[PDB]
Amino acid sequence: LRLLDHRALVCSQPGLNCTVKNSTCLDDSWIHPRNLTPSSPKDLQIQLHFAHTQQGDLFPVAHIEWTLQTDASILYLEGAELSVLQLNTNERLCVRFEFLSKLRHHHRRWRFTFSHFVVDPDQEYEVTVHHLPKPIPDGDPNHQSKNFLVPDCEHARMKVTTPCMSSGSLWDPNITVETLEAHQLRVSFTLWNESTHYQILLTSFPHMENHSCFEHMHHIPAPRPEEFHQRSNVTLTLRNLKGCCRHQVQIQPFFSSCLNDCLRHSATVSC
Amino acid sequence: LRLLDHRALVCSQPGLNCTVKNSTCLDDSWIHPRNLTPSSPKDLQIQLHFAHTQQGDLFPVAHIEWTLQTDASILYLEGAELSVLQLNTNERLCVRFEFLSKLRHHHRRWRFTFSHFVVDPDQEYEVTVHHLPKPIPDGDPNHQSKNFLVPDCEHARMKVTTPCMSSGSLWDPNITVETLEAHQLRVSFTLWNESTHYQILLTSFPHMENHSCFEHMHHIPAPRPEEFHQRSNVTLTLRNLKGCCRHQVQIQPFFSSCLNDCLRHSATVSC
Amino acid sequence: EPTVQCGSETGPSPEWMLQHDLIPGDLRDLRVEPVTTSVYSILMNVSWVLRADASIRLLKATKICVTGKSNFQSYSCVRCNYTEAFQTQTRPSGGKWTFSYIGFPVELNTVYFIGAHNIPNANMNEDGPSMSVNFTSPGCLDHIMKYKKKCVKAGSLWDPNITACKKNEETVEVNFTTTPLGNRYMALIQHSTIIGFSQVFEPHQKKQTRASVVIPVTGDSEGATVQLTPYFPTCGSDCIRHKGTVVLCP
Amino acid sequence: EPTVQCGSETGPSPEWMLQHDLIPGDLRDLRVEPVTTSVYSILMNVSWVLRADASIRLLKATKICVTGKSNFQSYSCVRCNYTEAFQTQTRPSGGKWTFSYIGFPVELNTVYFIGAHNIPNANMNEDGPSMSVNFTSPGCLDHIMKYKKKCVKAGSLWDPNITACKKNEETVEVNFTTTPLGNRYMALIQHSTIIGFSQVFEPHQKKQTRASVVIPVTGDSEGATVQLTPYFPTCGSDCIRHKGTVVLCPQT
Amino acid sequence: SCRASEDGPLNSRAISPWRYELDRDLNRLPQDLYHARCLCPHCVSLQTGSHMDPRGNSELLYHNQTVFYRRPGYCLERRLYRVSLACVCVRPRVMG
Amino acid sequence: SCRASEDGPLNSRAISPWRYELDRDLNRLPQDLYHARCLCPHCVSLQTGSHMDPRGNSELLYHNQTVFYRRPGYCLERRLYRVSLACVCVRPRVMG
Numbered sequence A, B: 001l002r003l004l005d006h007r008a009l010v011c012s013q014p015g016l017n018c019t020v021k022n023s024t025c026l027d028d029s030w031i032h033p034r035n036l037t038p039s040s041p042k043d044l045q046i047q048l049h050f051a052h053t054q055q056g057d058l059f060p061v062a063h064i065e066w067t068l069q070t071d072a073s074i075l076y077l078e079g080a081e082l083s084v085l086q087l088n089t090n091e092r093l094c095v096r097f098e099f100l101s102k103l104r105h106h107h108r109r110w111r112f113t114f115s116h117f118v119v120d121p122d123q124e125y126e127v128t129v130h131h132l133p134k135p136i137p138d139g140d141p142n143h144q145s146k147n148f149l150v151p152d153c154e155h156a157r158m159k160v161t162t163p164c165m166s167s168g169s170l171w172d173p174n175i176t177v178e179t180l181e182a183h184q185l186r187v188s189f190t191l192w193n194e195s196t197h198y199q200i201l202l203t204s205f206p207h208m209e210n211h212s213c214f215e216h217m218h219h220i221p222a223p224r225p226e227e228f229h230q231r232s233n234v235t236l237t238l239r240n241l242k243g244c245c246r247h248q249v250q251i252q253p254f255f256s257s258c259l260n261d262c263l264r265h266s267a268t269v270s271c
Numbered sequence C: 001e002p003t004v005q006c007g008s009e010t011g012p013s014p015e016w017m018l019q020h021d022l023i024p025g026d027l028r029d030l031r032v033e034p035v036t037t038s039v040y041s042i043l044m045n046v047s048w049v050l051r052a053d054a055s056i057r058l059l060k061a062t063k064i065c066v067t068g069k070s071n072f073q074s075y076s077c078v079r080c081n082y083t084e085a086f087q088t089q090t091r092p093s094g095g096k097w098t099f100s101y102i103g104f105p106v107e108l109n110t111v112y113f114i115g116a117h118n119i120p121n122a123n124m125n126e127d128g129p130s131m132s133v134n135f136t137s138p139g140c141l142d143h144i145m146k147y148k149k150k151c152v153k154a155g156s157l158w159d160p161n162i163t164a165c166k167k168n169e170e171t172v173e174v175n176f177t178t179t180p181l182g183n184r185y186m187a188l189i190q191h192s193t194i195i196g197f198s199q200v201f202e203p204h205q206k207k208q209t210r211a212s213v214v215i216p217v218t219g220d221s222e223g224a225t226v227q228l229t230p231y232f233p234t235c236g237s238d239c240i241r242h243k244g245t246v247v248l249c250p
Numbered sequence D: 001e002p003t004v005q006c007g008s009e010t011g012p013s014p015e016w017m018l019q020h021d022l023i024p025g026d027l028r029d030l031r032v033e034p035v036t037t038s039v040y041s042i043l044m045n046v047s048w049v050l051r052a053d054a055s056i057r058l059l060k061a062t063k064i065c066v067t068g069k070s071n072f073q074s075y076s077c078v079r080c081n082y083t084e085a086f087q088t089q090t091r092p093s094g095g096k097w098t099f100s101y102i103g104f105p106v107e108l109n110t111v112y113f114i115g116a117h118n119i120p121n122a123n124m125n126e127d128g129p130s131m132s133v134n135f136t137s138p139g140c141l142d143h144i145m146k147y148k149k150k151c152v153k154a155g156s157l158w159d160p161n162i163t164a165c166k167k168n169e170e171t172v173e174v175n176f177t178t179t180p181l182g183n184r185y186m187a188l189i190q191h192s193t194i195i196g197f198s199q200v201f202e203p204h205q206k207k208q209t210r211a212s213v214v215i216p217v218t219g220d221s222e223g224a225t226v227q228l229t230p231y232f233p234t235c236g237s238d239c240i241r242h243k244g245t246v247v248l249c250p251q252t
Numbered sequence E, F: 001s002c003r004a005s006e007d008g009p010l011n012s013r014a015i016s017p018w019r020y021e022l023d024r025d026l027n028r029l030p031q032d033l034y035h036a037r038c039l040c041p042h043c044v045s046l047q048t049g050s051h052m053d054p055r056g057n058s059e060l061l062y063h064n065q066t067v068f069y070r071r072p073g074y075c076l077e078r079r080l081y082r083v084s085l086a087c088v089c090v091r092p093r094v095m096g
């Protein structure tokens, strides 16, 4: 969402003096008509891209790119504007463009692209491209837009992203569930680099049934920095019942990100 | 069968000197082969014509015409020959031709025509056209022929012909068969301009039958010149029988031509 | 203020071979429909909506060619010009641009394919600048189109009235009124397969026209279908047919 | 001893435009026959007899052209020359003139029309000189012609062995051997009209290749005829069919 | 005259079979053009191929071909000709 | 999909009906050509017109048509094209 680098942006393409600016958004609706409204763009697409930072923090970014249309309307082109809209958080940013010099159709190709925006995983992204001047009232549209599906960090490529590890999926807790003594189970697993509490939900179900005979919760206090990357051991006494042999145990972190909403790892023991 | 008369015969066509001649024919040992003998004629046809005579002997004649092909063989043409052959009497005559100078194909049409021969009525005539040189042994033939049919005397135009006037079909006898008394028949008719006897053949048949009850022949003597074109009257006594009412009477001459073979006029009287 | 000025031309357009650096847009919309003028002939009405907001600052004309394909091949078209250039992108009075032209005579039972493009045309290695629509003409069986000379000569107007009744078990009697147009007719009788067949030849009846044709039939002919085919010369072997029914004769 | 040298040319003959004062005769006789070259191609052997006794004192060559028409159109031809000048009418050695030329490739199931005329040609407003003959080629159902690479793919050399017997009153079973070339087949049964029908799909069987196809039939199916039609891709919809017969399978 | 064979080309095997007639000329490319005159007034039966079935109708198809002509030396003239390719089996039109 | 109509042109009334596809090009005379594709693998029945009859086979017909192309202003060249015209009903070929 937030812009990545404050270095002078480069949009230079052969024979042009282009500038990029984050001006006022005003969503996608504004009134400023004029005599001639140029034509619509063509073949706009967005691609997935991966890049690190100066510190090396690999962030996911999008490769937005689009083509032109061939007609005399290229003579009267003046500007363009890029917008990004969020369906879930309703927060929308905007990008401003221009063309300091007039363009002639000289070589039969013209390309535009940009990849300077970080996207959030598992979020739909809306990108729209507009051309200036804006349409005169009661005129043909000059803007097109499409969707963008972003997977979750559990995917291999999405895994190695730096923003993931803050409540991420690369942290695989080695789950060791031992039968141990009768009516007693011992669970051991490794935890991550965050000083936030965990929780264990031990639920026992009868075989071939989803109902629960006995459900127990265990609270794991806030870890100390010295205890990072060390297996934590919890032993729990099970219900003394026959037929409720199926036990479901799950771990839920409470990291700074996705707090109360991060993924849970459930292990099933059946007899 | 005989040439009409002896006068310098005309065969001339533009740019050509031609001669006509009657001489020996029948191709008896006609093996006269030379090196390169021209092609065959084309589109030979014979037409019918009637020619008058100074004294009035109108004659029917056959109009023979034929055309030529358009190959290079026209350079080596030298001669031609015409033949007329009879079937029943086998009497046959020929007439020869010649082209004095070499003919060069300048324009595309050439025709040869001739009708100075009298044909006999109701006879079959064969006309053959040959080109000189004669073919080499085992060579492509260069002669074509056709059959020609002559109508008999009773034809409208063949009626007025003078060879038919001899033993004339134009001699039409007004036949007057009067019943008169019972068992007697009187017949009167006109005769022609020759002192030739006539025989009356009176035959009586029963009705619906071809057998003859009574057949009689009457001799009419040779007419005198003063009696020419005057009705001759002959009365005959019929058979005294019942049912033999159908009587056939026929008259035939013994003219100088078609003697014993001239046609008969038969009149039928039925009761 | 521009208008339309239509003529005619089939073949190579002089501006196709020459290259152009700037090209116009396309035909935004295009519709065609048939309109009939009478006191027979039917003509084509084609209307198109021009490009909007741009791509029109330069434009010369438009071409419309149409191909018909039924028992033949046909191809001819007319190119029209625009008298004056365009200053605006929509009519100052109001509404989108709309022109039309009347012509291109129509035959019977022929499918037409109509296409158009703007002038000058697109250079090589560019997008397909065309749009096309299709339309099918009515036939001769319709009520409106029974009075054309060709159809009546083929017998659209004719009223061959048929009364065919089962004469006996094995033969059937057919009555039908003749015409001076034709002299020979066929006969077909269909229930499940051919049950009878014949071929007849009768001259014109200035006399009373009730027919007396007898046709042998195999099996029970009750409830069959009587089909009559006329050998009218002008339609060749493809002459229109008329129905008939089997009735019972006491 | 004249000989004939032949080459290929299609289009307008240069003598047609010009005017010729004298013209030759025509071809007296013409025959066309096919020949087969030892291995695989088919070529047509033509022969003509030149005119006799005249009209050969001046002549140049003899053109032949051939038109074939089946599911396609075809037209291509060669004008072939003569080398020596002609001084006589028949052979000095004896007999008539017999020439020939081998070529003009032959396709399958195409009717051929052969025409020719002498050179130079007849001017405007003259008689029609030419003569023509017709000829037809065999198909792919004859023993001597089962082995083109073209028709093998259609299954000319295939040995589809079939066995169809009446399972019961309403069912008849068909046994047949599959091929790596085909994957899908029809099944037609004809006695008076359609009594049964089906459509099957089975791949190649490197295992035992005895088939098992069940087809429903209407009425008594005894004595009918069984036709099979394979969807070999090369032949499209014109793939050759192989006949069959229905027998009785006894329960015993 | 209404028969269907088993082998050979289409014209001897099509349901609406056509034969080839001869057109002769002295100033045409080609000299000989072979039109189509399909025989039977109606399409043939599929079950036998030797009899006639009257439920169908026969109709020629036409197409325009490129031929050259002579005209007065000579002159080069290019115009089309009307020839017939093949007949097809079409269904009837019935009124009432 | 195999059906026969009662009126209209031959393509909707023939035993072997054919539709028209689109061959679009930028440098061809005409711009659009319309080939024929046989919708039914077999010939339809005469009695009804809405069902199929397997005793037949469907085949196309082709002919050469004069078209023009451009190639580098520009240059004009002539070349023929192969375009399908109509499907016809043909009889099967059997072996045995």
Ligand SMILES: *[C@@H]1O[C@H](CO)[C@@H](O[C@@H]2O[C@H](CO)[C@@H](O)[C@H](O)[C@H]2NC(C)=O)[C@H](O)[C@H]1NC(C)=O
Pocket (backbone or CB within 6 Å): C161, C162, C163, C210
């Ligand atoms: C078809 O023709 C028949 C015979 O001409 C017509 O039958 C006539 O019917 C009327 C009753 O409306 C009777 O009065 C006549 O006597 C009938 N004709 C004869 C010859 O007896 C029938 O009406 C005709 N139908 C049409 C539609 O033309």
Ligand SMILES: *[C@@H]1O[C@H](CO)[C@@H](O[C@@H]2O[C@H](CO)[C@@H](O)[C@H](O)[C@H]2NC(C)=O)[C@H](O)[C@H]1NC(C)=O
Pocket (backbone or CB within 6 Å): C163, C164, C165, C173, C174, C175, C210, C211, C212
């Ligand atoms: C069909 O036409 C025939 C004659 O062409 C009709 O037959 C006559 O019908 C009348 C009616 O009473 C009789 O008086 C005649 O004796 C019949 N025969 C003739 C030769 O005239 C017949 O009625 C007509 N209609 C039908 C249904 O057959």
Ligand SMILES: *[C@@H]1O[C@H](CO)[C@@H](O[C@@H]2O[C@H](CO)[C@@H](O)[C@H](O)[C@H]2NC(C)=O)[C@H](O)[C@H]1NC(C)=O
Pocket (backbone or CB within 6 Å): D161, D162, D210
């Ligand atoms: C077709 O295939 C069948 C079976 O595949 C062949 O039948 C074989 O016949 C021989 C003697 O004729 C037996 O000894 C075999 O046991 C049979 N095979 C079986 C029963 O699987 C048949 O020969 C093949 N050829 C023909 C022409 O029918």
Ligand SMILES: *[C@@H]1O[C@H](CO)[C@@H](O[C@@H]2O[C@H](CO)[C@@H](O)[C@H](O)[C@H]2NC(C)=O)[C@H](O)[C@H]1NC(C)=O
Pocket (backbone or CB within 6 Å): D163, D165, D173, D174, D175, D210, D211, D212, D249
């Ligand atoms: C047709 O094929 C089937 C199987 O494809 C044959 O049925 C087999 O018959 C043998 C005995 O003859 C059994 O041992 C097999 O078990 C059968 N096959 C199956 C799958 O059960 C059949 O014999 C073949 N011939 C016919 C039907 O005539």
Ligand SMILES: *[C@@H]1O[C@H](CO)[C@@H](O)[C@H](O)[C@H]1NC(C)=O
Pocket (backbone or CB within 6 Å): A034, A035, A036, A136, C088
């Ligand atoms: C175009 O500009 C002129 C200024 O000369 C103005 O009068 C006119 O209203 C404008 N038209 C449109 C459609 O903007």
Ligand SMILES: *[C@@H]1O[C@H](CO)[C@@H](O)[C@H](O)[C@H]1NC(C)=O
Pocket (backbone or CB within 6 Å): A165, A166, A193
């Ligand atoms: C956990 O610890 C560091 C420091 O907080 C964190 O930046 C990193 O993502 C984790 N370490 C590793 C090795 O992944």
Ligand SMILES: *[C@@H]1O[C@H](CO)[C@@H](O)[C@H](O)[C@H]1NC(C)=O
Pocket (backbone or CB within 6 Å): A188, A230, A231, A232, A233
């Ligand atoms: C958990 O148990 C394992 C094995 O018994 C041991 O290696 C590990 O040190 C234990 N962890 C703690 C925090 O006691």
Ligand SMILES: *[C@@H]1O[C@H](CO)[C@@H](O)[C@H](O)[C@H]1NC(C)=O
Pocket (backbone or CB within 6 Å): B034, B035
């Ligand atoms: C043709 O003429 C030549 C001239 O010498 C001669 O030798 C030859 O025998 C002739 N041909 C014949 C007589 O058949």
Ligand SMILES: *[C@@H]1O[C@H](CO)[C@@H](O)[C@H](O)[C@H]1NC(C)=O
Pocket (backbone or CB within 6 Å): B165, B193, B194
């Ligand atoms: C009969 O008399 C003369 C002499 O025989 C003959 O020439 C003439 O033709 C005949 N008379 C008539 C009137 O014909």
Ligand SMILES: *[C@@H]1O[C@H](CO)[C@@H](O)[C@H](O)[C@H]1NC(C)=O
Pocket (backbone or CB within 6 Å): B188, B230, B231, B232, B233
């Ligand atoms: C024959 O009889 C008729 C009438 O009786 C008469 O005019 C004619 O003179 C008679 N003929 C002769 C030769 O007496």
Ligand SMILES: *[C@@H]1O[C@H](CO)[C@@H](O)[C@H](O)[C@H]1NC(C)=O
Pocket (backbone or CB within 6 Å): C005, C006, C007, C008, C079, C080, C081
């Ligand atoms: C358009 O203008 C050209 C140039 O004069 C002319 O040849 C053409 O016929 C015009 N189109 C019409 C009149 O439809």
Ligand SMILES: *[C@@H]1O[C@H](CO)[C@@H](O)[C@H](O)[C@H]1NC(C)=O
Pocket (backbone or CB within 6 Å): C073, C074, C075, C076, E064, E080, E082
């Ligand atoms: C094709 O032939 C028909 C025959 O009448 C003719 O009308 C037409 O102009 C020709 N050309 C085209 C392109 O249809």
Ligand SMILES: *[C@@H]1O[C@H](CO)[C@@H](O)[C@H](O)[C@H]1NC(C)=O
Pocket (backbone or CB within 6 Å): C033, C035, C045, C046, C047, C100, C101, C102
């Ligand atoms: C053509 O159709 C349009 C709309 O259907 C109509 O307004 C117009 O009058 C018709 N005729 C002409 C000549 O445009």
Ligand SMILES: *[C@@H]1O[C@H](CO)[C@@H](O)[C@H](O)[C@H]1NC(C)=O
Pocket (backbone or CB within 6 Å): C132, C133, C134, F020, F021, F022
């Ligand atoms: C013909 O018109 C129909 C009408 O819906 C359309 O669907 C079809 O695409 C058109 N065919 C072509 C080749 O454009």
Ligand SMILES: *[C@@H]1O[C@H](CO)[C@@H](O)[C@H](O)[C@H]1NC(C)=O
Pocket (backbone or CB within 6 Å): D005, D006, D007, D008, D061, D079, D080, D081
């Ligand atoms: C036939 O003669 C012509 C005229 O010179 C020549 O161009 C052509 O090549 C000859 N044909 C051959 C040599 O096959």
Ligand SMILES: *[C@@H]1O[C@H](CO)[C@@H](O)[C@H](O)[C@H]1NC(C)=O
Pocket (backbone or CB within 6 Å): D073, D074, D075, D076, F064, F080, F082
């Ligand atoms: C027609 O087109 C075919 C394409 O297969 C080509 O082989 C043939 O030479 C062309 N011309 C004729 C006359 O067949």
